[PDB]
Amino acid sequence: DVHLTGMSRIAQAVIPAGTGTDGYIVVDETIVPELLPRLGFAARIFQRYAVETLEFEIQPMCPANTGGGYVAGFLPDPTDSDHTFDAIQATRGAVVAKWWESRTIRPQYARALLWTSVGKEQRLTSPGRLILLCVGNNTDVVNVSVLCRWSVRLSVPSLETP
Amino acid sequence: DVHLTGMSRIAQAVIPAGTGTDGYIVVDETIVPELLPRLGFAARIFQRYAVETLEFEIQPMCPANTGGGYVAGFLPDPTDSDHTFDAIQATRGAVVAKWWESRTIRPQYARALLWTSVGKEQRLTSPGRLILLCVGNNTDVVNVSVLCRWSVRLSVPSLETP
Amino acid sequence: DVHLTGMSRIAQAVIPAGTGTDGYIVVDETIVPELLPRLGFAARIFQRYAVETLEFEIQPMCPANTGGGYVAGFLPDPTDSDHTFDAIQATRGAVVAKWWESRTIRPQYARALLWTSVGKEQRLTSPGRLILLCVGNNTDVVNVSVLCRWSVRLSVPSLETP
Amino acid sequence: DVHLTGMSRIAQAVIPAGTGTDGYIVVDETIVPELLPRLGFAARIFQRYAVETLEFEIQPMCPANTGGGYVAGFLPDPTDSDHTFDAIQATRGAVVAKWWESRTIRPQYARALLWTSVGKEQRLTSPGRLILLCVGNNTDVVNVSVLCRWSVRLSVPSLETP
Amino acid sequence: DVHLTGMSRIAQAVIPAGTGTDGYIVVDETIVPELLPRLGFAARIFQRYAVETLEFEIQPMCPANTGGGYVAGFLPDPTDSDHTFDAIQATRGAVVAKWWESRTIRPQYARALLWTSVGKEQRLTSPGRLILLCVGNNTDVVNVSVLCRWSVRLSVPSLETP
């Protein structure tokens, strides 16, 4: 029974000018233990993890003459069909800013007890998704690089071979 | 007897260059339960709602070379003729900023007990309006997207069919 | 015996490019009860007012490529000849910033007991002035819009006809 | 035995483009009672002053497309030969920023008991210097205007005639 | 047995346009007592130093039209082969920002008891490294100037001749 903390990049995308209109989904990746690089080498030990805190950052990178914008949130449904504006805006801990403006997400997690390995049902292995989509129309080349700030309490030891 | 919280976009407008001079009303929409998308599916249950807290944001989106400005407020008169600068400026919880500057409204609500359905008198169904108007003369394409942050205590159950 | 609060614009000026060099007085208006629009309809009732708190804002509006600057203060002498830099800088609660930078004045008032109507002596009807002057040389069109934040305790009822 | 407070500009310089490379000393003036305009008319009364607090600001004024930078500090040696980068950086309460970025110096004074009039030894009449030098290479016309925030306890009355 | 504090520049680099793509290591210097200029004249006295606090700043200097970015961290391995993105991101106290954005590192030191002089093993003379690398593609000439904020408790007197 341990307690791990850290900070990890989830994903990164670059968007040229003109491409990246409103509703263009910038990035969409679930919170599976494979993506976090310190926890990916620590979910290969234990079997069950239960998240205590989980916060995000967005940290986009563009000059101050682009002037579009984005929206970011957290959906605790690890489903496979959510491409819209309205569900991201209405969740708890959602932000909206410009492409040179950095915000901070403090979402509403599940506090259940999950499983580390992959399986047939996705609702017991990944406590949420992160969806990011543009809302204006970009002018220059932007560069988003989303982060994560996790803290978890792995238990019941094993050793997987993924 | 419940208590709901959330955060919801009210409205959104885009303004080209040249159009949008001083006193051009950018957006003007009352706080009716239809506009908030999580509360619109929850005012269809109950009958009476009484707001506890209600705060706003403006979050406009433009590059830093536009240089106009705006003013935002909250009028607890849900009337149908208010197109001026002076009444918005003089209320409680009014802001003024540039089009690339985001502020936060903490207004003075009514704390009465209202009704959810539409009716002949508007003073018992919507506790205020939101008026937003430009004060300078824009240079580039701006993009405002006002928000809301409501909290309410719906009671006496029913089921409407609007 | 009452207590009023609020927030009110005092004045507004626009300055083209080239005009508005150093020492050009941007705006200079005393704090008479006529200028505040909610208190102007409330000094017409009572006779004596004594200010409790009084704070200011500047809120200028220009793009981030102008690069001049300003200085703002508060002089509790309601005289009629003060056009200089040194007296504004040396008062209590003075600020200095750029034309796209907004500051906040917390001045040193008089806490005496004044009169509302106009009279032969100016030292009993207006507890200060607001002087604003440029210090650099502007590049683009700026737009200043000074504010006020007053709180006062009107007493001894009457009714004037100004 | 008194206690005076206030705020005063020390100096001001303007730097054209190209001139003002790295190590170009922008301004260098000691803290003599002559330079502060409210204390200059109050050091002409008393004889001995002992500083209680002393803080600075820099407040430079340029558009956001210049992109050089500066460094600022406080040296409690009122000597007459200090033209370098390393001694300013290594003191207590030193700052570094861009030419459109404003910082705040909270230095380490002497808390001795000095003399107001000029004399043969400089170490008993001025408790420090202020040196400001560029570190990049400017692009546009900048305009620095350093400030001061003094508080002192003049005593033993006299009257000088400087 | 003493306690020293201060603030010192570690290093400085300038990057032209085009050069300085992603993964280009901007600066990489260990925390040896030679680099800090006040502690370099104080490690020549004592023999053993044990750090109490150690924090960093980045303070980069460019106009707001460059729009690349960086990442900064602290590795308590004073090894000689670490040129990657992933190890810097995953440490404790790592930051990411734009080239006109300044952040602050609060790292995780070793709190052991080291030696001041150079030796055959590097793990007893320098409690960490500082690696800084670009993540976007620069547009204009940037100018980074990293800082340090150390506090240490030198003991057991000697005198080296390096």
mmCIF file of C-alpha atoms in Angstrom, chain C residues 6-156:
data_model
loop_
_atom_site.group_PDB
_atom_site.id
_atom_site.type_symbol
_atom_site.label_atom_id
_atom_site.label_comp_id
_atom_site.label_asym_id
_atom_site.label_seq_id
_atom_site.Cartn_x
_atom_site.Cartn_y
_atom_site.Cartn_z
ATOM 1 C CA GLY C 6 -22.084 53.171 -5.205
ATOM 2 C CA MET C 7 -19.649 53.561 -8.080
ATOM 3 C CA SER C 8 -19.645 56.239 -10.729
ATOM 4 C CA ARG C 9 -17.736 57.468 -13.743
ATOM 5 C CA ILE C 10 -16.347 60.961 -13.274
ATOM 6 C CA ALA C 11 -15.041 61.750 -16.748
ATOM 7 C CA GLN C 12 -13.734 60.456 -20.067
ATOM 8 C CA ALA C 13 -11.341 61.763 -22.713
ATOM 9 C CA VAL C 14 -9.885 60.491 -25.984
ATOM 10 C CA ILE C 15 -6.399 61.488 -27.151
ATOM 11 C CA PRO C 16 -5.184 61.127 -30.765
ATOM 12 C CA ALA C 17 -1.647 60.281 -31.772
ATOM 13 C CA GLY C 18 1.025 62.959 -31.402
ATOM 14 C CA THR C 19 -1.210 65.170 -29.296
ATOM 15 C CA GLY C 20 -0.849 64.288 -25.643
ATOM 16 C CA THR C 21 2.819 64.894 -24.921
ATOM 17 C CA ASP C 22 4.380 65.117 -21.461
ATOM 18 C CA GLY C 23 2.570 67.388 -19.033
ATOM 19 C CA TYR C 24 -0.577 67.538 -21.180
ATOM 20 C CA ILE C 25 -3.333 67.524 -18.565
ATOM 21 C CA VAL C 26 -5.720 64.790 -19.653
ATOM 22 C CA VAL C 27 -8.583 65.501 -17.267
ATOM 23 C CA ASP C 28 -9.100 67.765 -14.263
ATOM 24 C CA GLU C 29 -12.455 67.780 -12.480
ATOM 25 C CA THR C 30 -13.335 68.441 -8.855
ATOM 26 C CA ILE C 31 -15.421 66.089 -6.700
ATOM 27 C CA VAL C 32 -18.624 68.127 -6.581
ATOM 28 C CA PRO C 33 -21.893 66.233 -5.878
ATOM 29 C CA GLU C 34 -23.177 67.178 -9.359
ATOM 30 C CA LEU C 35 -20.827 64.815 -11.210
ATOM 31 C CA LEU C 36 -21.741 61.545 -9.500
ATOM 32 C CA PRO C 37 -25.076 60.548 -11.090
ATOM 33 C CA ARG C 38 -26.542 58.571 -8.191
ATOM 34 C CA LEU C 39 -25.361 61.088 -5.615
ATOM 35 C CA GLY C 40 -26.448 64.030 -7.762
ATOM 36 C CA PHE C 41 -30.038 62.914 -7.241
ATOM 37 C CA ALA C 42 -29.322 62.454 -3.530
ATOM 38 C CA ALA C 43 -27.485 65.654 -2.744
ATOM 39 C CA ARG C 44 -30.645 67.407 -3.916
ATOM 40 C CA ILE C 45 -32.349 66.030 -0.810
ATOM 41 C CA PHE C 46 -29.993 66.516 2.098
ATOM 42 C CA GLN C 47 -27.791 69.434 3.203
ATOM 43 C CA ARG C 48 -24.594 68.114 4.756
ATOM 44 C CA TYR C 49 -22.459 65.225 3.614
ATOM 45 C CA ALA C 50 -19.347 63.740 5.183
ATOM 46 C CA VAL C 51 -17.368 61.210 3.174
ATOM 47 C CA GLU C 52 -16.363 57.955 4.853
ATOM 48 C CA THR C 53 -14.428 56.178 2.111
ATOM 49 C CA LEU C 54 -13.475 57.381 -1.343
ATOM 50 C CA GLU C 55 -11.377 55.401 -3.823
ATOM 51 C CA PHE C 56 -10.706 55.736 -7.539
ATOM 52 C CA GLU C 57 -9.772 53.695 -10.578
ATOM 53 C CA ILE C 58 -8.334 54.814 -13.895
ATOM 54 C CA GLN C 59 -9.176 51.979 -16.355
ATOM 55 C CA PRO C 60 -7.578 53.249 -19.599
ATOM 56 C CA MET C 61 -8.242 51.548 -22.915
ATOM 57 C CA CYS C 62 -5.655 51.248 -25.688
ATOM 58 C CA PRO C 63 -3.789 48.475 -27.502
ATOM 59 C CA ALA C 64 -0.481 47.269 -26.130
ATOM 60 C CA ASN C 65 1.579 49.114 -28.751
ATOM 61 C CA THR C 66 1.110 52.674 -27.503
ATOM 62 C CA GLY C 67 3.607 52.725 -24.677
ATOM 63 C CA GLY C 68 3.259 56.184 -23.180
ATOM 64 C CA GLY C 69 2.108 56.557 -19.606
ATOM 65 C CA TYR C 70 0.275 58.608 -17.047
ATOM 66 C CA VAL C 71 0.197 59.687 -13.419
ATOM 67 C CA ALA C 72 -2.832 60.113 -11.197
ATOM 68 C CA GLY C 73 -3.481 61.507 -7.781
ATOM 69 C CA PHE C 74 -5.833 63.393 -5.524
ATOM 70 C CA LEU C 75 -5.423 66.931 -4.210
ATOM 71 C CA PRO C 76 -7.631 67.973 -1.270
ATOM 72 C CA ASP C 77 -7.285 71.615 -2.325
ATOM 73 C CA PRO C 78 -10.255 72.493 -4.552
ATOM 74 C CA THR C 79 -8.335 75.505 -5.888
ATOM 75 C CA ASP C 80 -8.297 76.613 -9.515
ATOM 76 C CA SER C 81 -4.609 76.751 -10.461
ATOM 77 C CA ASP C 82 -2.666 73.455 -10.328
ATOM 78 C CA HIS C 83 -1.079 72.456 -13.659
ATOM 79 C CA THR C 84 2.210 70.696 -12.857
ATOM 80 C CA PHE C 85 3.754 67.288 -12.383
ATOM 81 C CA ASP C 86 5.384 67.615 -8.977
ATOM 82 C CA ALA C 87 2.336 68.205 -6.790
ATOM 83 C CA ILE C 88 0.446 65.213 -8.201
ATOM 84 C CA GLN C 89 3.388 62.859 -7.719
ATOM 85 C CA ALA C 90 4.085 63.816 -4.110
ATOM 86 C CA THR C 91 0.596 63.384 -2.663
ATOM 87 C CA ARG C 92 -0.646 60.374 -0.733
ATOM 88 C CA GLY C 93 -2.105 57.663 -2.917
ATOM 89 C CA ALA C 94 -0.513 58.471 -6.249
ATOM 90 C CA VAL C 95 0.040 56.012 -9.082
ATOM 91 C CA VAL C 96 2.014 55.772 -12.310
ATOM 92 C CA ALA C 97 1.494 53.229 -15.088
ATOM 93 C CA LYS C 98 1.278 52.703 -18.832
ATOM 94 C CA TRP C 99 -1.735 53.540 -20.980
ATOM 95 C CA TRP C 100 -2.758 49.875 -21.107
ATOM 96 C CA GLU C 101 -2.203 49.393 -17.380
ATOM 97 C CA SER C 102 -4.944 50.006 -14.828
ATOM 98 C CA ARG C 103 -4.244 51.065 -11.253
ATOM 99 C CA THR C 104 -6.194 51.992 -8.131
ATOM 100 C CA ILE C 105 -6.012 55.158 -6.034
ATOM 101 C CA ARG C 106 -6.631 55.035 -2.271
ATOM 102 C CA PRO C 107 -6.325 58.714 -1.337
ATOM 103 C CA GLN C 108 -6.273 60.776 1.861
ATOM 104 C CA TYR C 109 -9.602 62.606 2.200
ATOM 105 C CA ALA C 110 -10.599 65.369 4.616
ATOM 106 C CA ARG C 111 -13.221 63.691 6.923
ATOM 107 C CA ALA C 112 -14.756 67.073 7.693
ATOM 108 C CA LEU C 113 -18.440 68.011 7.346
ATOM 109 C CA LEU C 114 -19.224 69.871 4.152
ATOM 110 C CA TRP C 115 -22.203 71.493 2.406
ATOM 111 C CA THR C 116 -24.001 70.239 -0.696
ATOM 112 C CA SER C 117 -25.050 73.435 -2.452
ATOM 113 C CA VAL C 118 -22.733 75.751 -4.343
ATOM 114 C CA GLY C 119 -21.319 78.767 -2.565
ATOM 115 C CA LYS C 120 -18.783 81.563 -2.626
ATOM 116 C CA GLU C 121 -16.080 79.486 -0.921
ATOM 117 C CA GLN C 122 -15.104 76.250 -2.623
ATOM 118 C CA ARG C 123 -13.432 74.719 0.455
ATOM 119 C CA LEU C 124 -16.748 73.622 2.024
ATOM 120 C CA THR C 125 -18.435 71.914 -0.928
ATOM 121 C CA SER C 126 -15.956 69.607 -2.655
ATOM 122 C CA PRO C 127 -13.346 67.555 -0.809
ATOM 123 C CA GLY C 128 -10.725 67.283 -3.532
ATOM 124 C CA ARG C 129 -9.792 67.240 -7.199
ATOM 125 C CA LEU C 130 -8.591 64.598 -9.646
ATOM 126 C CA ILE C 131 -5.771 65.502 -12.023
ATOM 127 C CA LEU C 132 -4.455 63.147 -14.710
ATOM 128 C CA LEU C 133 -1.575 63.964 -17.045
ATOM 129 C CA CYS C 134 0.512 62.141 -19.612
ATOM 130 C CA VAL C 135 4.236 61.571 -19.105
ATOM 131 C CA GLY C 136 5.453 60.018 -22.343
ATOM 132 C CA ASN C 137 4.501 60.591 -25.961
ATOM 133 C CA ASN C 138 1.591 58.497 -27.240
ATOM 134 C CA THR C 139 1.765 56.272 -30.296
ATOM 135 C CA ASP C 140 -1.827 55.176 -30.898
ATOM 136 C CA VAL C 141 -5.293 56.377 -29.947
ATOM 137 C CA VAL C 142 -5.833 55.936 -26.231
ATOM 138 C CA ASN C 143 -9.113 56.196 -24.327
ATOM 139 C CA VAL C 144 -9.123 56.828 -20.610
ATOM 140 C CA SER C 145 -12.262 56.488 -18.495
ATOM 141 C CA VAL C 146 -11.692 57.343 -14.832
ATOM 142 C CA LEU C 147 -14.024 55.939 -12.156
ATOM 143 C CA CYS C 148 -14.888 56.650 -8.528
ATOM 144 C CA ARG C 149 -16.028 54.655 -5.505
ATOM 145 C CA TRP C 150 -17.713 56.847 -2.919
ATOM 146 C CA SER C 151 -19.471 56.283 0.398
ATOM 147 C CA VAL C 152 -21.111 59.119 2.309
ATOM 148 C CA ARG C 153 -23.506 59.925 5.187
ATOM 149 C CA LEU C 154 -25.940 62.707 4.096
ATOM 150 C CA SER C 155 -28.031 64.300 6.870
ATOM 151 C CA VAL C 156 -30.338 67.249 7.875
#
